[PDB]
Design a binder for this molecule. Structure first.
Ligand SMILES: CC(=O)Nc1c(O)cc(C(=O)O)cc1[N+](=O)[O-]
Ligand SMILES: CC(=O)Nc1c(O)cc(C(=O)O)cc1[N+](=O)[O-]
Ligand SMILES: CC(=O)Nc1c(O)cc(C(=O)O)cc1[N+](=O)[O-]
Ligand SMILES: CC(=O)Nc1c(O)cc(C(=O)O)cc1[N+](=O)[O-]
Ligand SMILES: *[C@@H]1O[C@H](CO)[C@@H](O)[C@H](O)[C@H]1NC(C)=O
Ligand SMILES: *[C@@H]1O[C@H](CO)[C@@H](O)[C@H](O)[C@H]1NC(C)=O
Ligand SMILES: *[C@@H]1O[C@H](CO)[C@@H](O)[C@H](O)[C@H]1NC(C)=O
Ligand SMILES: *[C@@H]1O[C@H](CO)[C@@H](O)[C@H](O)[C@H]1NC(C)=O
Ligand SMILES: [Ca+2]
Ligand SMILES: [Ca+2]
Ligand SMILES: [Ca+2]
Ligand SMILES: [Ca+2]
Ligand SMILES: [Ca+2]
Lengths: 390, 390, 390, 390
């Protein structure tokens, strides 16, 4: 039978190139004969033999007449769905896993674990599904919107670690960590370090002994609190990334926050998810970041890198690596994923491109994928090609 | 090759939580591009590697123009269909098994058996299908609408037991039992005890030596006749559940039926299916019941429990365990199902939520699933989110 | 790997009952969101692990605007398609095998062979497909519409035998036989006996040493020429069935054709396909026939039997066994099929029910299946439930 | 596990016959309920157990409202999609592999490699995908629309060879060759001989030691430069086919280009893809060509042959072998493919039939397949049966 997954050295490449685009709404005209689901919070988790495209649907499709409610984040209709990667998320292609308005996913070499969050805002709840079975739950500790990553969780030899959090968006949201094995929580990690507001952690293996996530602070700063989880002692420590190249949105001009690394500067009320992906080489490591082109809005998407060094102390700017999405195209949530080759892991960064015709219409995104391919420079950007009028 | 199924100890949990929702009609607008089938009598039967969502379709989809006939129970168009669980029951996703207007299903570790009932009301007939093969039938003994469970049948080491019945709804409907092995009836069980009217038996393993069903009495009482089948001697004995917490609908105020356990009280003409599921623990057992919130109507759904004791004699009230469906939401048929983990069985209760715009329109339901997850208390209810006007 | 198929003793039963109904057009309203293909000439061929529903589509779906041409039998658009049995023949569910306006199919325990016929009426051609590969062809010998069975072909230990024919409908159509192994014709059988007009042979194993087909004579008689192929010497002999119960349509009153068995009587210009299926028992054999209720038209369907005896000499009437389709319902082509159980073969008879709103509309059928189940008598008929106006 | 593919001797046959037709737009009426994708550049690549129908979709379906842009060759929406052969290329049936506006595909007995080209016209890029993984890229050497075959690539014992090119359509487009193993380029072949303009190479194994492609010269000639790649030394040599029967389009009367084989004659600005397929016999070889009936336009399709001899020197005319598509039907790109039997390879030629209602509408093709079957002569042509008004 199957064996447990561990990260290996990433495949060989020097830059990312444009891989794939799933734009369901290109097939959502009232004059079309198709039915793409209203979803957001998309992500890809790649198991051994396959990758899955997950998302939270509003239990609604376009065209239709259940548009009002779609721009809202949490309700009793949302669900975690998936289609194997490369398939359009239509009503029939999609498998509905469980009810949730927050979520994550990961395949341990042997099976899929699905994490989903639902219930009351004051008493929400985390739910685990191992394959087809409901196996566990984790309660709301801070009684203030229990949430999870919204990206892939990370398994190493049978144990998968998940980030959750709880608290006010404008205040203190302190995240814990969940160690799940066979769809059951075998440990509850309480991080150390700057813990004032950590949410929507994009986590990836920086080797076998450690996992690092670039995350989200909704209040206090435009910097990203950076996690490092030692899988061997089962301890967590978080501290803000020191790079003058700020990754959250909004943010001010770069290098504008004066003072030691550990200084938040101004609050810049809000945040956004950003893709973070390692390129574990033999003698060295590359970390890839992507951020919105706009500093106040969700317009555009550009990706950077900086090999080695320490996320925590390096004041320095990151090396820009090209533009995946132009300022005229949307650039919302971002996450990183990894494809399993025979003898190497391929790093990738997905970019949710939300179709936002505002308040009285439907609300869904597209998904542009970029993955490390060969050398030279990033060559093309992505456009959705969607007309919200059709 | 595959091995025979037996129940094991249920997985560890203390309460049920909201698992999943399949609302096909959320995708049935005339302005939509989808096609969910008009069905009712839904149920889930979980084999080793998978669960299936079954139902009797009126061989019709929404939107369409074959709505007139859908509110009726038996005709020559109805069929037993299935989709793996988590898939929406559309025209193309669904597999049609055989023609039937009554039915059941169960997977013996090796294959699916499908039971379906059709023919004339005066001479209906039970039909068995082992995998893809028609293998057997069982004739109408009381010539008065031969029917079956409408929920999952129960297999233990190669033998599956099914409940059937026959008779007037307003009168005497005495049920027999069918022992099927390899899609062929190897024994005909005639129960003992109070046998005046037993129908729509929700049956589940209360261990290896016994199966218990909470069922339906359409005439004589608002209590539920409770079955106990000893799989070892192949004998059946039925007696009304003594709980002051009445489970059928309609029913009067609880504890209102004065007298020994065995007393029907007033007729309360009618009944409904209710989900019943055991939580077999090592030193003890939990039985889970769900009933309509409304005592005269099919509005709402709440679930209870009471560990151990005897269904037959216990006059006592049951412990309420939360509300799965609110009084403003429908709560029709209910059934229990069990998911197969690696080393444990997960108990579940499905709730059919019928969309009933009455007499001159379409008639189909939704399916809300709740399964045992962790501890604390049931946290959320279900709503269909369907507008019968679209 | 897989082993070669041979017929075994049929499963145990005494009568046929109503098994399944595939009515695609129940989902073909202009107000529906579905797309069932315009097809006719449906048949089912059951391999080891599965049965397939085949048909010749006019490369068109309902609703649409390619209806004109559908009532015609041969054109350059027709194709042999299939869906596993129980699935509705829609545009996406269906697999297109090859181009043909005549056809057959059979699975040898190891793979599917697909036979299809196309080309000019004066120089048509038979084409073999083994799995996904084009392997062979067989030319038009009588240059007058080379055709094939329109039902399942029959394989025994690696060799499959197929009937073809060629000639005028109003005149002499002498059929040959094709022995195919691994998708290649290894022998060309020329039958013996009355060979004036044999077409659309419904063939089934009457044991290991022989295959018998009840067939079609378009000119000369309302009786059915009956084939017997000895698989051991590879010889064929045909002679008209002697039963006073005539099986072709049209036909006159039964027992009206005076004279020895071998007498055609009046021509009764025309014919139709009829399902023929054996029930090979240990000490005996049952042959099942179905014929139209109407003697001049294609209205209704009734099925008969007569165990043992000789198709060739028995003047006697057959035993009626019930009505599968009422005079108010259509009853066109019929064929027999067999389902593979673990230790027995289940006999079946399918009935094509053509939706014929005549000349200026669409033209497609439904498929009612009846299979041997238990004992007693056939209990129900089939209706399509289709309204050609929607 | 699986073993590496090598070509074997082709199956036995003498002529090609009409195999299959995939006309998605037959299901694209505004009154239909289907959704076929706007695609062109279709091709089939057959692995061991299966064949796939690939094409570059304009990320659009018919009916819809994204028609404007479809007649253009390169944009940021195009994608390489596939459906197993015999399935209609609809939105849900189709798998999207990667973004590309040029492409190829091939299965090495063990896995699928997908090649796709995208990026800026001045700096386009070749991209390799082994199974689900992005593994490599190859940059634009002549900075003038890096393109690839548009047909199947060819693998022999683990190594697959691909043709690419780069340059002006009106000028010098010199092609290189790519040797890919496990989805990574292990060698870059630079051909020898007449190398002025070689593009869209249709390549097939002429044995184990060699691969030959009949290709496209957009400027200089109406003859086809003919490649021969020695898989053993990894060298390439190209020279124009000498046949008086010219294969490119446009072309003048045949035998009109006076002079030695190596003479281009007049430019005949333009070209088209043509199917080329070998029939490797034991003592001899057959090469099959197909060309447009029209000499100036893309109307019709006829196929020829000539066994043995040398593509390079033979001035002679080819033997016509029938007409697959009539002058009243379109005949655009053509390619050759091979189906894997148990002990032999079946040669095939696909013909893209473009639906070209010009400038302000949708733009997609159909696919007619012809494969070697038995003997005698090609018997039928193909028509799409599409009405661009519906
Ligand atoms: C818990 C929750 O509602 N999830 C959530 C989203 O679904 C979306 C966004 C967002 O910033 O667009 C934000 C948040 N968020 O609150 O983090
Ligand atoms: C035999 C039959 O018609 N089945 C049936 C149903 O399908 C539904 C109901 C019902 O109470 O809604 C009731 C019954 N019932 O009669 O039990
Ligand atoms: C060869 C051919 O055209 N096949 C055919 C059909 O498809 C249908 C019928 C028929 O009697 O309805 C008849 C015939 N037939 O001619 O046998
Ligand atoms: C590179 C590119 O644009 N590919 C391409 C096509 O997609 C189509 C045609 C063509 O001749 O129709 C031609 C060409 N071509 O330029 O070869
Ligand atoms: C982690 O462990 C596995 C073996 O247990 C090894 O193959 C893998 O490469 C390790 N990770 C890295 C980056 O080396
Ligand atoms: C019933 O039998 C099987 C072994 O035959 C055992 O594993 C199972 O646990 C038993 N049921 C229970 C509740 O113990
Ligand atoms: C025909 O042959 C196989 C063994 O080769 C046997 O099992 C089968 O039963 C035979 N057919 C019948 C009716 O006995
Ligand atoms: C090429 O090699 C394989 C064995 O490696 C052989 O079977 C195949 O036939 C060869 N090709 C031809 C045409 O012989
Ligand atoms: Ca569909
Ligand atoms: Ca912030
Ligand atoms: Ca009652
Ligand atoms: Ca006749
Ligand atoms: Ca040219």
């Amino acid at each position: 039978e199957p064996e447990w997954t561990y990260p290996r050295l990433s495949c060989q490449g020097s830059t990312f190139q444009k891989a794939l685009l799933i734009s369901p709404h290109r097939f959502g005209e009232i004059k079309g004969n198709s039915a793409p689901l209203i979803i957001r919070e998309p992500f890809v988790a790649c198991g051994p033999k396959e990758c899955r495209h997950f998302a939270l649907t509003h239990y609604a499709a376009q065209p239709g007449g259940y548009y009002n409610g779609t721009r809202k984040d949490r309700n009793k209709l949302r669900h975690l769905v998936s289609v194997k990667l490369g398939k359009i998320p239509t009503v029939e292609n999609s498998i509905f896993h469980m009810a949730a308005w927050s979520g994550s996913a990961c395949h341990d070499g042997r099976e899929w674990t699905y994490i989903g969050v639902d219930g009351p805002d004051n008493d929400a709840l985390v739910k685990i599904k191992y394959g087809e079975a409901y196996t566990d739950t984790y309660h709301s500790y801070a009684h203030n919107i229990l949430r999870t990553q919204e990206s892939a969780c990370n398994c190493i030899g049978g144990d998968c670690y998940l980030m959750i959090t709880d608290g006010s968006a404008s205040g203190i949201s302190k995240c814990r960590f969940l160690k799940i094995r066979e769809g059951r929580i075998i440990k509850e990690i309480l991080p150390t370090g700057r813990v004032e507001h950590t949410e929507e952690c994009t986590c990836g293996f920086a080797s076998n002994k450690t996992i690092e996530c670039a995350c989200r602070d909704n209040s206090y700063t435009a910097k990203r609190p950076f996690v490092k989880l030692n899988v061997e002692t089962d301890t967590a420590e978080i501290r803000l990334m020191c790079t003058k190249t700020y990754l959250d949105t909004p943010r001010p001009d770069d290098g504008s926050i004066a003072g030691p690394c550990e200084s938040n500067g101004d609050k810049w009320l809000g945040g956004i998810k950003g893709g973070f992906v390692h390129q574990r080489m033999a003698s060295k490591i590359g970390r890839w970041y992507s951020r919105t082109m706009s500093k106040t809005n969700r317009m555009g998407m550009e990706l950077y890198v900086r090999y080695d060094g320490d996320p925590w102390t390096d004041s320095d700017a990151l090396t820009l690596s090209g533009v995946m999405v132009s300022i005229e195209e949307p650039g919302w949530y971002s996450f990183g994923f990894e494809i399993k080759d025979k003898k190497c892991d391929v790093p990738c960064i997905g970019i949710e491109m939300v179709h936002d015709g505002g308040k009285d219409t439907w609300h869904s995104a597209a998904t542009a994928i970029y993955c490390l391919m060969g050398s030279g420079q990033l060559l093309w950007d992505t456009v959705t090609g969607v007309d919200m009028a059709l």
